Structures are given as structure tokens and as C-alpha cells.
Amino acid sequence: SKKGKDGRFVNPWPTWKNPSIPNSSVPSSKEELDKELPVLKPYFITNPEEAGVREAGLRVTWLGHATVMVEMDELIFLTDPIFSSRASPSQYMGPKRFRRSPCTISELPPIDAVLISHNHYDHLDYNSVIALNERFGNELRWFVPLGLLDWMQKCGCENVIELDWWEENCVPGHDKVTFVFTPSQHWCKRTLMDDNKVLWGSWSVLGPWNRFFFAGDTGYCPAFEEIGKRFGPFDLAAIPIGAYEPRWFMKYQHVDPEEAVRIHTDVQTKKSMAIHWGTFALANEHYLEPPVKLNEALERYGLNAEDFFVLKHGESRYLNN
Amino acid sequence: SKKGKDGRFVNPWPTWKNPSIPNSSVPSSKEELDKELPVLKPYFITNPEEAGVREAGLRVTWLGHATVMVEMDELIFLTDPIFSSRASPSQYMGPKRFRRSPCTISELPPIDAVLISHNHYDHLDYNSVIALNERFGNELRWFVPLGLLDWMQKCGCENVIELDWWEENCVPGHDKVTFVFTPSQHWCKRTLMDDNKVLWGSWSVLGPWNRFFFAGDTGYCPAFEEIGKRFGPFDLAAIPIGAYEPRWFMKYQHVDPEEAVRIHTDVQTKKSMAIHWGTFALANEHYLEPPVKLNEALERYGLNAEDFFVLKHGESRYLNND
Ligand SMILES: C[C@H](CCC(=O)O)[C@H]1CC[C@H]2[C@@H]3CC[C@@H]4C[C@H](O)CC[C@]4(C)[C@H]3C[C@H](O)[C@]12C
Ligand SMILES: C[C@H](CCC(=O)O)[C@H]1CC[C@H]2[C@@H]3CC[C@@H]4C[C@H](O)CC[C@]4(C)[C@H]3C[C@H](O)[C@]12C
Numbered sequence: 001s002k003k004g005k006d007g008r009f010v011n012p013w014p015t016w017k018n019p020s021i022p023n024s025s026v027p028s029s030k031e032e033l034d035k036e037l038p039v040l041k042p043y044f045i046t047n048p049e050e051a052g053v054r055e056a057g058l059r060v061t062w063l064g065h066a067t068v069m070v071e072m073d074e075l076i077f078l079t080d081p082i083f084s085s086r087a088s089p090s091q092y093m094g095p096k097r098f099r100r101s102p103c104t105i106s107e108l109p110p111i112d113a114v115l116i117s118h119n120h121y122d123h124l125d126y127n128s129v130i131a132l133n134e135r136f137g138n139e140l141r142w143f144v145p146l147g148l149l150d151w152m153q154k155c156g157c158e159n160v161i162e163l164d165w166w167e168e169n170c171v172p173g174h175d176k177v178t179f180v181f182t183p184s185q186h187w188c189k190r191t192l193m194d195d196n197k198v199l200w201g202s203w204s205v206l207g208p209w210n211r212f213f214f215a216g217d218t219g220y221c222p223a224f225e226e227i228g229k230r231f232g233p234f235d236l237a238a239i240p241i242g243a244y245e246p247r248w249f250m251k252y253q254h255v256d257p258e259e260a261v262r263i264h265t266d267v268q269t270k271k272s273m274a275i276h277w278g279t280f281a282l283a284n285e286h287y288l289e290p291p292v293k294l295n296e297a298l299e300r301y302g303l304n305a306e307d308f309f310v311l312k313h314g315e316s317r318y319l320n321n
Numbered sequence: 322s323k324k325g326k327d328g329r330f331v332n333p334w335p336t337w338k339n340p341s342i343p344n345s346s347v348p349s350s351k352e353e354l355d356k357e358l359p360v361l362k363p364y365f366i367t368n369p370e371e372a373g374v375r376e377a378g379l380r381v382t383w384l385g386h387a388t389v390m391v392e393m394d395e396l397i398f399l400t401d402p403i404f405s406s407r408a409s410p411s412q413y414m415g416p417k418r419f420r421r422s423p424c425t426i427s428e429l430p431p432i433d434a435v436l437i438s439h440n441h442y443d444h445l446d447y448n449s450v451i452a453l454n455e456r457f458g459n460e461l462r463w464f465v466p467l468g469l470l471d472w473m474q475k476c477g478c479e480n481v482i483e484l485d486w487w488e489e490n491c492v493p494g495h496d497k498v499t500f501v502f503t504p505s506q507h508w509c510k511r512t513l514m515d516d517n518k519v520l521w522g523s524w525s526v527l528g529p530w531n532r533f534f535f536a537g538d539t540g541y542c543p544a545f546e547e548i549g550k551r552f553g554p555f556d557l558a559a560i561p562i563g564a565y566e567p568r569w570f571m572k573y574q575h576v577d578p579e580e581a582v583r584i585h586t587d588v589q590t591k592k593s594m595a596i597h598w599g600t601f602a603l604a605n606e607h608y609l610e611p612p613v614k615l616n617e618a619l620e621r622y623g624l625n626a627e628d629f630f631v632l633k634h635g636e637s638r639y640l641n642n643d
């Protein structure tokens with residue numbers, strides 16, 4: 001069976017799945033925030049000694065927003081890493097995170113990979129890229145959507161692979177682990193009139209012992225079912241649950257928690273972790289709403305927190321095979 | 322006796338003292354940096370319970386670069402606070418600090434004041450201003466040079482006083498403590514063609530039990546002798562010791578350690594603390610050189626580390642009165 005294999009107008013990419021048409025969060029007080037969204041020191045600060053591996057995956061650490069660190073099958077990789085305060089081309093305006101990054105880039109050791117779902121300042125953060133590339137160099141491989149190679153090259157990144165969807169590659173030392181850029185329903189833009197000059201997508205990571213899915217930003221299309229059927233079952237999937245209100249505007253580009261759980265099903269993962277949410281105010285929902293709505297969905301679909309969990313900032317979770 | 326009381330061309334301010342004419346730092350490796358310039362958690366993180374006061378001053382915490390937290394005579398105040406990574410109007414270019422700020426703005430409680438010496442991205446940091454103002458509001462009074470009021474107002478700061486030199490004011494609750502804007506030899510610029518639209522200076526803080534001096538960025542002029550004589554003796558002075566090489570270009574605007582110790586003498590402080598240095602690479606000296614040269618100066622002038630000390634990032638020091 002074939003898949004959404006996309007896809008251009010004569011210039012930019014469009015989504016092509018037909019669920020696409022081209023059509024009050026309120027935090028404050030340092031005490032309440034710490035109460036509701038505490039920031040934990042990741043394990044690797046006081047126990048830098050080992051992780052990943054061991055021997056059959058799989059460990060994840062939520063570093064906020066859509067940044068997760070994943071340890072499996074002898075690799076540690078990083079998704080959409082944003083360690084800066086502001087997701088913006090400007091110092092002066094644009095969204096400031098209200099929970100600090102749980103660690104600095106000087107802690108970590110990504111061997112040998114990062115995964116970028118789309119450009120977009122809250123996923124592709126120049127200062128984070130620079131810092132990562134200053135620290136590791138060649139020794140870090142960047143997997144990015146078709147059309148971003150150049151941008152990364154100009155940041156000084158030399159070990160970069162650019163992918164159309166359903167295209168696949170690995171990290172040179174570790175050929176047993178396939179990285180596949182898979183579809184998603186979203187968009188790209190960093191400047192004026194660059195709309196969708198670069199692809200957006202999800203990542204399916206296929207190792208000998210484990211399989212991990214990273215949704216990126218989306219919502220809700222076939223494709224998740226295509227992915228679920230082509231790869232899958234997956235062991236863990238990271239799926240956004242924030243930035244969804246108001247529905248009439250956001251639904252084409254952002255799942256709500258209900259739709260998040262439909263992706264969880266469609267993709268055939270044993271478990272999922274909530275990302276996006278709780279970090280930047282990018283839409284109108286009360287900053288604590290997404291986890292509440294997640295649980296309402298789970299209850300409705302006959303599932304459980306065990307199946308689709310939300311971490312604290314900086315928390316880790318081990319998933320035994 | 323009178324003082325350099327300055328001073329304009331017909332537009333911008335100029336220095337007017339005649340020591341003014343209008344004419345390789347190499348860090349790296351996380352391990353070495355932590356070895357040479359460790360970053361300490363300030364006391365107020367695990368012991369937020371009391372400071373300052375007690376009862377007769379004075380406590381200081383070095384937060385990096387020219388940002389110092391000072392506790393005396395029932396106030397806590399903050400100088401040139403920069404808690405961001407990059408001193409720049411851009412995200413994309415401009416100097417990145419190589420030692421992280423030792424704390425976030427969410428730790429602290431400045432009652433009720435910040436002191437700005439000059440505009441200039443490594444001393445006036447927008448994101449730090451916004452964050453401070455978001456946290457405290459009206460409760461925090463900002464003392465700034467003549468010409469900066471509006472800029473601050475547009476940041477949303479509502480409790481702001483602007484001062485020419487030798488002008489004085491206090492924090493409303495605490496009238497026993499006088500803040501005086503005093504001269505310095507430096508310059509101002511944030512954009513194109515705004516050179517010296519806003520004054521630059523130092524701050525003399527006069528309390529019932531203590532007196533503190535903050536040099537700002539400068540190099541070496543009379544004025545420090547004017548300040549030493551008008552106010553003074555001082556209990557503590559914070560004085561820059563980095564950003565001085567190459568001398569032929571920088572000496573009109575930045576003291577070297579040697580000149581730092583001349584300021585220490587001129588200003589008649591019992592003690593001084595090194596600031597500027599060790600945080601951003603703003604000039605050409607080896608990042609560790611300033612402290613070495615400071616000690617060579619101290620030795621030459623018959624003084625001691627006890628007289629003019631350097632802190633680690635985030636370290637505090639208490640100075641008991643007498
Ligand atoms: C240069 C000043 C800052 C001066 C200061 O800090 O005192 C800043 C403040 C606001 C900044 C502008 C914000 C809007 C635009 C943002 C774009 O992404 C780049 C160009 C513009 C036009 C920016 C140009 C420049 O970055 C400005 C004008
Ligand atoms: C920073 C200068 C003005 C500085 C001055 O008055 O000297 C002003 C003048 C024009 C200003 C822009 C006008 C259009 C926009 C209006 C928005 O509400 C905020 C962002 C923008 C992009 C503004 C950003 C910034 O506030 C600018 C660039």
C-alpha cells in the first residue's frame with residue numbers, strides 16, 4: 001500500500017492530504033509556576049556516567065517544548081533543540097519561554113544526532129545550533145527536512161543530511177539504526193515570502209531493539225496511519241498536545257489532545273509522551289489545559305496515563321523492552 | 322573646590338577632562354574554564370533568608386562582568402545588570418559571555434534599586450530590564466544617566482530617575498541613603514549616529530553606615546580625585562580591570578589594572594572589588610591577565626589583595642564596618 005509521498009505546487013511544498021485548507025493562556029508568579037511546572041535537574045548533571053543503551057533501550061528526557069533527548073540502541077539523539085529563552089529572530093519581541101531550559105548545552109553528549117522537524121523558531125533555534133555545533137562538530141550528524149541543508153551549512157554544520165519524506169539514512173558508526181523522515185501536516189516559514197520553501201515532517205527511528213516516533217508539529221491527517229502501518233509497532237512516540245486553541249484557526253496545523261491520542265493509536269506505539277505544551281505561550285489555551293484534556297481523551301478512548309504520559313521539565317523515563 | 326561639571330558640544334556630551342582624545346583573549350574547553358573561573362551558586366539561592374543590612378552594612382555579590390549586587394543600610398541594589406548570554410542588539414552576532422550568569426532574575430530581591438552607568442550593550446541589557454521590570458514594577462527604582470529616562474520608560478519602567486553629574490536622589494522609603502551620579506571618562510552608543518546622546522558616569526552611594534562607589538566603565542581621569550575628596554572615605558568600590566588592550570586605542574575609555582589601582586587610591590576607598598573582566602571577551606588581553614596585572618599594580622603601590630580583591634563568579638563578600 002502506497003503513502004502520501006509529497007509534493008509541490010511549482011515552488012513551495014503543500015500538504016496534499018485533504019484535511020488541510022489554507023485558512024488567554026495566563027501564567028504568572030514564580031511560586032505558582034514552580035508548584036505546577038517544576039524544573040528538575042536532569043540525571044546526567046549529577047550522574048553524567050552512562051546513558052543511553054542498556055542493552056535494549058530506551059530512555060527519554062523531556063527538555064521542554066519539543067526538545068527531547070532519546071537514548072536507544074547505542075545512540076543519544078536530540079529533537080528540535082531550543083536552549084534559548086526566546087523563540088524569535090529578534091531579541092526584542094517574540095515568545096519568551098516561561099519555564100527555563102532544564103540544562104545547558106554544556107551538559108549532554110548527542111552521539112551522533114539531532115532531528116529537526118521543521119524550521120520555525122520554537123523548533124529550529126540558531127543560538128542552540130551554533131552552541132551545539134561549537135561543542136561537537138563533525139561528530140554530530142544533523143537530520144533535517146528537504147530544503148534546510150544550506151541553512152545548516154551556513155551555521156557551520158558540516159555533517160548534515162537533508163531528506164524528502166520516506167527517505168532514510170543512518171549515523172555512520174551505527175548503521176543498524178535507520179532514521180526516516182516521515183510526513184506530517186504543518187508548514188514552514190522563517191522570514192518574508194519563504195513560506196514552505198523547506199519541508200516539515202516527523203521522524204521515525206528504527207533500531208534493532210527499539211523504535212521511536214517523533215511527531216514534530218502537526219495535526220491530524222492520514223499519514224500517521226501510513227507510518228503506523230509501514231513501520232510500527234513503535235516503542236515510544238513523542239506527540240504534541242499544546243498550541244491548539246482556537247480550534248477554528250489552529251486545527252489544520254496543530255492537533256489538540258484528543259487528536260494527539262488518535263495519532264498515538266494511528267501510529268501503533270506502545271506508549272507516548274506529551275511534547276510542545278507547558279513551555280511557551282503559542283496559542284490561547286490556559287497553560288495547564290493540555291494535560292487535563294489529554295486525560296479526558298485517554299479516558300474516552302479506553303486508555304490510561306500509563307499509555308500516554310506527561311513528564312515534568314527535565315524528568316526522564318526508562319522504557320524496558 | 323569645584324569639579325568637572327559636564328558638559329556639551331552643542332548636541333552630544335563630551336568628556337572635557339584633557340586625558341580624553343577622540344582616537345587574543347583566547348578561552349576554550351569547559352573543563353579549563355571551570356578550573357579557572359568557576360561559577361558559584363550565590364548564597365541567596367539556598368539561603369534566601371536574610372540579606373542585606375545587619376546592621377551597619379555591607380555585603381556584595383559579583384554576578385559577573387559589571388553586575389554587582391550590593392546590600393547596605395537596608396537596601397539591596399543592582400548595578401549594570403546583564404543576565405542574558407549575548408551583549409548585542411542582535412541574536413546572531415555580538416559578544417557571548419563565556420561564563421554563565423550565576424543566577425536568574427527569578428532569584429534576588431532589589432529594594433528598591435538598579436544603577437546604570439552608561440548605555441552599551443554589556444551594561445544596559447534589554448532582556449534583563451524587561452525581566453526585572455516584569456518581576457518588581459513600581460517597587461524597583463532605576464537610577465540612570467541624563468538622557469536615558471525615555472528609553473527606560475519605553476521598556477515599561479515607571480519608577481525612574483535620570484541624573485546629570487553631581488546630581489543626587491534617594492529611594493523614597495529610605496531617604497537616609499543618597500545616590501549620586503558622578504563623573505567618569507567613557508562614552509555612549511546603542512545605534513547609528515546616537516553617539517553620546519546619553520551621559521556615562523559612576524555612582525557614589527552614601528548611607529548612614531556605609532559608602533559604596535561604582536566606577537562604571539572609564540579610564541583614567543581627574544574626577545576620581547574629585548569624588549574621593551567630595552565624598553569619601555568609601556567603604557567599598559567596584560572598579561573595572563578588564564577590556565584594556567591594546568593600550569594605544571583603549572586607554573582613553575578603559576583603565577588597565579594599574580589605572581584601576583590609581584582610581585582605588587584617588588577615590589579613597591578602604592577596599593575595592595574588580596569588575597568588568599572574566600565574563601565577555603571585549604578586547605585583546607588574555608582572559609586571565611587582568612587579575613595578574615592587578616596584583617602587579619598592588620605590589621608596586623605598596624598594597625595588598627586584601628585592599629583590592631577579585632571574586633569568583635557568584636561569590637559574596639561581607640565588609641564589617643571599621
Ligand atoms: C537596533 C534596535 C535596538 C536598539 C537598542 O537596543 O537600544 C532594534 C530594536 C527593534 C529592532 C527592529 C525590530 C523589527 C524588525 C525585526 C526584524 O527581525 C529585523 C529588522 C527590525 C526592523 C529590527 C531592527 C533592529 O533590530 C531594531 C530597530
Ligand atoms: C524602534 C523604532 C522606533 C525608534 C525610535 O522611535 O527612534 C520603531 C519604529 C517603527 C517600529 C515598528 C513599526 C511596525 C511594527 C509595529 C508593532 O507595534 C511592533 C513591531 C514593529 C515592526 C515596530 C518595531 C519598532 O518598534 C520600530 C522599528
Ligand SMILES: C[C@H](CCC(=O)O)[C@H]1CC[C@H]2[C@@H]3CC[C@@H]4C[C@H](O)CC[C@]4(C)[C@H]3C[C@H](O)[C@]12C
Nearest residue numbers: 126150151152153154155156190412413414415
Ligand atoms: C553575519 C554572520 C557572520 C558574522 C561574521 O562574519 O563574523 C552570519 C554567520 C551565520 C549566519 C546565519 C546562518 C544561518 C542563516 C543562513 C540564512 O541564509 C540567512 C540567515 C542566517 C540566520 C545567517 C545570518 C548571518 O549571515 C549569520 C549569523
Ligand SMILES: C[C@H](CCC(=O)O)[C@H]1CC[C@H]2[C@@H]3CC[C@@H]4C[C@H](O)CC[C@]4(C)[C@H]3C[C@H](O)[C@]12C
Nearest residue numbers: 089090151154189190191192193194195197413
Ligand atoms: C536588503 C538586502 C540586500 C543584500 C545586501 O544588502 O547586500 C537583502 C538581502 C537578503 C535579505 C535579508 C536576508 C534574510 C531575509 C531574506 C528574506 O527573503 C527577506 C527578509 C530577510 C531578513 C532579508 C531582508 C533584506 O532585504 C536582505 C538583507
Ligand SMILES: C[C@H](CCC(=O)O)[C@H]1CC[C@H]2[C@@H]3CC[C@@H]4C[C@H](O)CC[C@]4(C)[C@H]3C[C@H](O)[C@]12C
Nearest residue numbers: 088089090119126151190191410411412413414
Ligand atoms: C531575520 C534574519 C534571521 C533569519 C533566520 O534566523 O533564519 C536575521 C539574520 C541577520 C539579521 C541582520 C543582521 C544585521 C542587522 C542587525 C541590526 O541589528 C538589525 C538589522 C540587520 C540587517 C539584521 C536583520 C535580521 O535580524 C537578520 C537578517
Ligand SMILES: C[C@H](CCC(=O)O)[C@H]1CC[C@H]2[C@@H]3CC[C@@H]4C[C@H](O)CC[C@]4(C)[C@H]3C[C@H](O)[C@]12C
Nearest residue numbers: 089150151154190191192193194411413414415
Ligand atoms: C542575511 C543576509 C543574506 C541572506 C540571503 O542571502 O538570503 C545577509 C546579506 C547581507 C548581509 C550583511 C552584509 C553586511 C555585513 C557583512 C558582515 O560580514 C556581517 C554583517 C553584515 C551586516 C551582513 C549580515 C547578513 O549576513 C546579511 C544581511
Ligand SMILES: C[C@H](CCC(=O)O)[C@H]1CC[C@H]2[C@@H]3CC[C@@H]4C[C@H](O)CC[C@]4(C)[C@H]3C[C@H](O)[C@]12C
Nearest residue numbers: 346409413414415416417418419601602603604
Ligand atoms: C563581537 C563579536 C565577538 C566578540 C566576542 O565574543 O568576543 C563578533 C561576532 C561578529 C562580529 C561583527 C560582524 C560585523 C562586523 C565585521 C567587520 O569586520 C567589522 C566588525 C563587526 C562589527 C563585527 C563586530 C565583532 O567583531 C562581532 C560582533
Ligand SMILES: C[C@H](CCC(=O)O)[C@H]1CC[C@H]2[C@@H]3CC[C@@H]4C[C@H](O)CC[C@]4(C)[C@H]3C[C@H](O)[C@]12C
Nearest residue numbers: 091092093094447451471472473474475476477
Ligand atoms: C516593538 C516592541 C513592542 C511589541 C508590541 O507592541 O507587542 C517594543 C516594546 C519595547 C520597545 C523597546 C523599548 C526600549 C527601546 C526604546 C527605543 O526608543 C527604541 C529601541 C527600544 C529597544 C524599543 C524597541 C521596540 O519598540 C520595543 C521592543
Ligand SMILES: C[C@H](CCC(=O)O)[C@H]1CC[C@H]2[C@@H]3CC[C@@H]4C[C@H](O)CC[C@]4(C)[C@H]3C[C@H](O)[C@]12C
Nearest residue numbers: 333410508509510511512513514515516517518
Ligand atoms: C557612517 C555610518 C555609521 C556611523 C556610526 O553610527 O557609527 C555607517 C553606517 C553604515 C555605513 C555604510 C554602509 C554601506 C556602505 C558600505 C561601504 O563599505 C562604505 C559606504 C557605505 C555607504 C557605509 C558608509 C558609512 O560607513 C555608514 C553609513
Ligand SMILES: C[C@H](CCC(=O)O)[C@H]1CC[C@H]2[C@@H]3CC[C@@H]4C[C@H](O)CC[C@]4(C)[C@H]3C[C@H](O)[C@]12C
Nearest residue numbers: 092410411472510511512513514515516517518
Ligand atoms: C526606517 C525607520 C522609519 C520609521 C518607520 O518606518 O516608521 C526608522 C525609524 C527609526 C529607525 C530605527 C530605530 C533604532 C535606530 C535609530 C537610529 O538613529 C538608527 C538605527 C535604528 C535601528 C533605526 C533604523 C530605521 O531606519 C528606523 C526604524
Ligand SMILES: C[C@H](CCC(=O)O)[C@H]1CC[C@H]2[C@@H]3CC[C@@H]4C[C@H](O)CC[C@]4(C)[C@H]3C[C@H](O)[C@]12C
Nearest residue numbers: 409410411414415416510511512513514515516
Ligand atoms: C562591513 C560592512 C560593509 C560591507 C560592504 O562595504 O559591502 C558594513 C555595513 C554596515 C557596517 C556597520 C554599521 C554599524 C556599525 C557602525 C560603526 O560605525 C562601525 C561598526 C558597524 C558594525 C559597521 C561595520 C561594518 O563595516 C558594516 C557591517
Ligand SMILES: [Zn+2]
Nearest residue numbers: 120122123217
Ligand atoms: Zn511549534
Ligand SMILES: [Zn+2]
Nearest residue numbers: 118120186217
Ligand atoms: Zn511550528
Ligand SMILES: [Zn+2]
Nearest residue numbers: 441443444538
Ligand atoms: Zn563595558
Ligand SMILES: [Zn+2]
Nearest residue numbers: 439441507538
Ligand atoms: Zn562601555
